[PDB]
Design a protein around this nucleic acid. Structure first.
Lengths: 237, 25, 127, 708, 54
RNA sequence: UUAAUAGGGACGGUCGGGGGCAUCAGUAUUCAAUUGUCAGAGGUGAAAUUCUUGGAUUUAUUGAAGACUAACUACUGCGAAAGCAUUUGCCAAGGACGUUUUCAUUAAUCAAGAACGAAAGUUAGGGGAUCGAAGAUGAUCAGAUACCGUCGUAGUCUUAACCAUAAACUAUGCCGACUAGGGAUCGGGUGGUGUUUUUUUAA
């Protein structure tokens, strides 16, 4: 309420005058994604020009939908987090930071008259990257089923959780973080779980609900350059 | 630690100077 | 030739915030609210205040250089309502009318799996 | 460690001796902390007393920031202020005990103590022998990454210009020209190289300290009573991270010429320049040129020393150049100017694989493709010669790739059908690839590496960028079937079948883990990809690669890196290679197992239980094979707990020949120093010990088609 | 190669088919003892070795 | 003498949001650090106390504290009742089913007495995020929005004892027999059957 009848406030007494457009000193910066993604171009960001600029850039986290990175609407419904790690000539070299799905779906999949199964595991990659994985799967009815619901016994639930628990540990331990992301895009992890859990009970909508990055090793620029696949200056004549 | 301690003692007696030459000098 | 922003919309029952930032979200580009574009406090949540705020950022956004944004609508969430109100919807329309390109729309309202007790009590509230 | 109480400003590494060790440790018994608390107690034993002093020297700094004062005749206290030189003040006597201790030597002394403090805290592995029963001062080139010898002019008195540069302010400061000259060369070398190096040592070769009673001062043959030395040798401990940087950054540009920038411009002279970069920063920096024969370190020291010390100096380090030349030069654009540390060729091969890696996913198959894991040598930066487009004459042109499909219950239960089903999958892949992507060419080949499995067929893909890939299918049912064969096999035949399994897991299962960890580890160890290649090159010259599997050579060559103690991490091509020679020469593979922690420099480190578990395996094996005929080299790790995966089937003569070559090579080094003549002997085969020798020639020259 | 793979497996599916029928065909001994065969069992040779293994 | 469509005990595989002790996760609330920006933020029908140019609100990277297990959630489950919804492990208990295993009347009802007994409350420690009797304070204009807003004590959590009351409901003593049909669901067991499954690891 900027109206006149709106009563005066104490804070209104002291008002710093606006003497700078902050974006006069801002400078744009272009983000690039790791090589595992098809579309490396993922936009740009802005920071105050160095008096340094790199400090504010390091540790920056950008979240984006997979569809933009893979150019497929079969990934319009998944989201990835990328963190800035290295800066070179206005280009940002990022590394995978996390993955999560959109809220609207999680409401969409969750429906009445079945059982919700969730499993979680804490595990480290071969790169000493400690991550936490969340997996979601639902029971389904058979083709000739006549019962209205498809509830599964808790003994089955514990059996399914163990199978989901053991498997998720297997891939993460026997793979690197960059390799681990490479499996996420073709959603390969889900289809084992269907097959491994196939005999126990028929499931549906099997997904790795979320991925969290708990701990990171000592940073290695040499590795990061490899994941992204130096430059002499111009003389002031 | 016990293994290391015994290893020290073995090293010392190997490098221990012979007392006969001490009298000689 | 296409720079993306993030237009974070927070539609509260007494006010609506239009906020545009970079993709990371660290750098605020333009934050406007229904209150600064209205004369009385009750119309802060009104849709009309929202169009003014949304238009104001859009003009600011074009000056900056950004030409598209990703909107992340949200409500107060928590122990209160989870769906954005008319103000948040109205602001979304204004951004489209402003001419800026829309990238993606998603509802990021905080949803608690378990929630603390609400302020209303047992008999209820919102009387 | 080659540390003595002798003078160091002259050039000899030392200045810290028993007395300095004793005086220091005495002070700690009286205090030493910032709060003047005792760090050592009179009740401590020898291990504890030694541990504290080594721990003390490692972490508290005595030269730049901080110094100690004590009272010989009053609790010893650590001061935060530093005198910029190694200082151990004695208030009672007003004597600094570290005056003989040089700044440059002090950092090396600090590195050794801190490096040893890590082994002292180590509990997994015994370190008594390394800390105490291993001389690292025998060879400078093993102990130092780079060595340059500089021949000063007019060496029966030094030239008037150099003698004139001595100056009167320096006689008072540095009593002898040798002390002054050592300081001069150090400061310019330190200032010039900067971050490119970690530690520098200047040694005055042929310096005497005893003279006949008939003479007043020492007489050097070249000295003529003027200078007591033959020549100066510049030894470095290089920093692999920033050794090969093209441009040496300097102070940023400003309106008024700043002092730091001013010295930068004066120091580099014409070589100085002011350059801009993509980020937009304007800074004073000088640009160098990379070469495939010598590092940037050779050029910078040559120019820097000549400009400041004397324009007539002669700097030469031919040993590294000869080592560099032995590395096969790839037939790529700008190959000569490329540095030995660049892996662009390997990355380009990976990029080509990525394009194919995309195509195979999008192809529709009866079973969804699970994962494709490249396992070729180039993918881990170990191929002897770098990949070259269309250079198909190379043996390593076709890189093995593992294809794995979604787990299915429909796989054949009998082996011979299983691969024939795998071939059917490969057949369809080829057809669709031929149709959708005609630019890719393909053909099938016969693989017989696994004994008695004569039906495994591999698909060879010729990529349009000019790279070859070999694809083989992996099935989960495959591994159990081999176990099934072992169980049903006759008792006499079971030892044969398990060998067949051993090769299978070596190619399919363990190979995946091998390439993964080596690839990631290789980034931290910059010089691993070169040194291994020369190591394989050295084996090939003596006809040893034929029996030694490429993996085994890699594990032997990484031992100096994962386990550099008592030495440092190699940062030079020469240092890494010769250390591998040193280890093999002294390796008692009959009684000593080789086990490696494939981890990055300080988890996945071997624990006490795992460590002891691997040790029990070696004892059990040696109990059955004490003389070691069946197995010679025991190489184990997290990937290989059995320890026999990559070292089985090697004939004893080749194992002995390998060690015999390493021993003799080290003996030649001790008898004759590293030089052009010796290094040629290292890499040339005698060929006389063999009973009969057959000469073969190919119809055409294959060097060009090998990309060399 | 294509012909060889086709002929080889085509024979295999026949041999696999008869084997699975044989095990699940209500085998009864001359003295009337009905062999117990579990579902998904494919080869009688497999049943024998399972006994030998255990 | 039976082994009662009396009862007890046993054993086999199951079954349970039954209980306790640890253990794991989960957002959410509040608070704190850093981070970009700038005039309001909050609240109600209309307002004012209140916070805020030492940067509020909002943005984003984290951390800490105490509660609590959404959606899935059902005329579905367990427990005598009161009540009981994250994972994993330990601890003992148990209904039903199966049984060509065992006791041989050991049973029904019922005083005093005893165990527990929703929420609230009392005594003495710990904790105290949220909500919140009481108390203080802003506004006291307008009847569908007419009692709201801010601070918030005891309490809400837990440890060791007291208090023993609920629309603690089938508004409805107990034990035993008999007196209609129908298909839905839960647990167990029996037979058949062809789909999903699957192959000498086992299961």
């Amino acid at each position: 309420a900027v109206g006149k009848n709106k009563r005066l406030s104490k804070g209104k007494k002291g008002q710093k005058k606006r003497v700078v457009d902050p974006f006069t000193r801002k400078e744009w910066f272009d983000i690039k994604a790791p090589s595992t993604f098809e579309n490396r171009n993922v936009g740009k960001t802005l920071v105050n020009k160095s008096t340094s600029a790199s400090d504010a850039l390091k540790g920056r986290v950008v979240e984006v939908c997979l569809a933009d990175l893979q150019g497929s609407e079969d990934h319009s419904f998944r989201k990835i987090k990328l963190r800035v790690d290295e800066v070179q000539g206005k280009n940002l070299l990022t590394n995978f930071h996390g993955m999560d799905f959109t809220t609207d779906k999680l409401r969409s999949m969750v429906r009445k008259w079945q059982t919700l199964i969730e499993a979680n595991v804490t595990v480290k990659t071969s790169d000493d990257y400690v991550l936490r994985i969340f997996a979601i799967a639902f029971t389904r009815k058979q083709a000739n089923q006549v019962k209205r619901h498809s509830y599964a016994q808790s003994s089955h639930i514990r059996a399914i959780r163990k199978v989901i628990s053991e498997i998720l540990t297997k891939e993460v331990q026997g793979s690197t973080l960059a390799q681990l992301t490479s499996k996420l895009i073709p959603e390969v992890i889900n289809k084992e779980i269907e097959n491994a859990t196939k005999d126990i009970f028929p499931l549906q909508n099997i997904h790795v609900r979320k991925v969290k990055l708990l701990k990171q090793p000592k940073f290695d620029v040499g590795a990061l350059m490899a994941l992204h696949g130096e430059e002499k200056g111009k003389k002031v004549t | 630690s016990n293994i290391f301690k015994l290893q020290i003692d073995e090293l010392l007696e190997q490098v221990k100077l012979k007392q006969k030459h001490v009298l000689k000098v | 030739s296409q720079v993306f922003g993030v237009a974070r919309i927070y539609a509260s029952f007494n006010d609506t915030f239009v906020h545009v930032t970079d993709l990371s979200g660290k750098e605020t580009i333009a934050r406007v609210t229904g209150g600064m574009k209205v004369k009385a406090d009750r119309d802060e949540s009104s849709p009309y205040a929202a169009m003014l705020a949304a238009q104001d950022v859009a003009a600011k956004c074009k000056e900056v250089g950004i030409t598209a944004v990703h909107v992340k609508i949200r409500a107060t969430g928590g122990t209160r309502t989870k769906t954005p109100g008319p103000g948040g919807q109205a602001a979304l329309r204004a951004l489209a009318r402003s001419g800026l390109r829309i990238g993606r729309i998603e509802d990021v309202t905080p949803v608690p799996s378990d929630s603390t007790r609400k302020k209303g009590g047992r008999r209820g509230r919102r009387l | 460690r080659g540390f003595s109480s002798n003078m160091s400003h002259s050039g000899s590494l030392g200045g810290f001796g028993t007395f300095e060790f004793t005086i220091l440790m005495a002070a700690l018994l009286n205090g030493g902390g910032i709060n003047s608390n005792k760090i050592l107690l009179h009740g401590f034993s020898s291990y504890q007393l030694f541990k504290g002093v080594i721990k003390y020297l490692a972490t508290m700094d005595l030269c730049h920031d901080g110094h100690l004062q004590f009272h010989s005749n009053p609790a010893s206290k650590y001061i935060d202020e530093g005198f910029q030189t190694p200082t151990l003040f004695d208030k009672s006597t007003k004597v600094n005990i570290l005056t003989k201790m040089t700044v440059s030597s002090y950092q090396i002394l600090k590195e050794y103590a801190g490096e040893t403090l890590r082994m002292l805290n180590n509990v997994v592995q015994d370190q008594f022998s390394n800390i105490f029963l291993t001389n690292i001062s025998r060879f400078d080139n093993l102990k130092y990454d780079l060595c340059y010898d500089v021949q000063l002019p007019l060496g029966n008195n030094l030239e008037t210009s150099l003698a004139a540069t001595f100056g009167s302010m320096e006689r008072v400061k540095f009593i002898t020209l040798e002390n002054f000259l050592a300081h001069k060369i150090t400061n310019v070398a330190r200032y010039a190289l900067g971050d490119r190096i970690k530690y520098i040592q200047i040694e005055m070769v042929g310096q005497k300290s005893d003279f006949p009673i008939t003479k007043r001062k020492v007489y050097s043959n070249t000295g003529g009573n003027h200078f007591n030395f033959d020549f100066v040798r510049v030894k470095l401990i290089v920093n692999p991270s920033e050794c090969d940087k093209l441009v040496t950054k300097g102070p940023a540009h400003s309106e008024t010429m700043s002092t730091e920038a001013a010295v930068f411009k004066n120091f580099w002279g014409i070589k100085s320049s002011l350059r801009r970069f993509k980020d937009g920063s304007i800074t004073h920096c000088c640009v160098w040129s990379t070469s495939s024969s010598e590092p940037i370190i050779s050029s910078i020291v040559n120019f820097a020393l000549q400009k400041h010390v004397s324009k007539k100096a002669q700097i030469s380090n031919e040993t590294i150049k000869k080592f560099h030349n032995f590395l096969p030069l790839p037939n790529l654009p700008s190959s000569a100017k490329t540095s030995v540390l660049n892996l662009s060729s390997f990355f380009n091969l990976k990029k080509s694989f990525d394009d194919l890696y995309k195509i195979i996913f999008q192809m529709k198959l009866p079973l969804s493709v699970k994962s494709i894991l490249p396992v070729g040598s180039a993918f881990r930066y170990t191929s002897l010669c770098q990949p070259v487009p269309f250079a198909y004459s190379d043996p390593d042109f076709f890189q093995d790739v593992i294809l794995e499909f979604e787990t299915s219950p429909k796989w054949p239960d009998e082996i011979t059908s299983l691969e024939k089903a795998k071939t059917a999958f490969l057949l369809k892949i080829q057809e669709e690839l031929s149709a959708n992507s005609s630019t890719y060419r393909s053909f099938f080949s016969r693989d017989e590496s696994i004994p008695y499995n004569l039906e495994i067929v591999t698909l060879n893909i010729l990529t349009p960028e000019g790279y070859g890939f070999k694809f083989r299918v992996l099935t989960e049912r495959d591994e159990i079937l081999y176990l099934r064969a072992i169980a049903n096999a006759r008792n006499e035949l079971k030892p044969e079948l398990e060998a067949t399994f051993l090769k299978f897991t070596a190619k399919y299962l363990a190979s995946v883990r091998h390439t993964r960890t080596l690839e990631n580890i290789s980034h931290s160890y910059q010089f691993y990809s070169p040194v291994v290649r020369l190591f394989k090159r050295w084996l090939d010259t003596h006809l040893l690669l034929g029996h030694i599997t490429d993996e085994l050579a890699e594990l032997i060559a990484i031992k100096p890196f994962v386990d550099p103690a008592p030495y440092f991490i190699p940062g030079s091509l020469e240092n890494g290679f010769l250390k591998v020679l040193k280890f093999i020469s002294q390796w008692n593979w009959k009684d000593d197992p080789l086990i490696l922690d494939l981890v990055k420099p300080e988890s996945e480190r071997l624990t006490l239980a795992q460590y002891k578990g691997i040790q029990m395996n070696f004892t059990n094996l040696r109990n059955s094979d004490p003389n070691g005929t069946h197995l010679q080299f025991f190489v184990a790790s997290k990937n290989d707990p059995s320890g026999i995966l990559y070292s089985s089937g090697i004939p004893l003569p080749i194992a002995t020949r390998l060690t015999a070559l390493a021993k003799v090579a080290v003996n030649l080094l001790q008898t004759h120093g590293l030089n052009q003549q010796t290094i040629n002997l290292l890499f040339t085969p005698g060929l006389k010990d063999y009973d009969f020798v057959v000469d073969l020639r190919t119809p055409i020259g294959l060097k060009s088609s090998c990309g060399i | 190669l294509k012909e060889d793979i086709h002929t080889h497996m085509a024979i295999f599916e026949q041999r696999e088919a008869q084997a699975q029928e044989d095990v699940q065909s209500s085998i009864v001994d001359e003295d009337g003892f009905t062999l117990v065969v579990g579902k998904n069992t494919k080869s009688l040779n497999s049943i024998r070795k399972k006994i030998l293994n255990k």
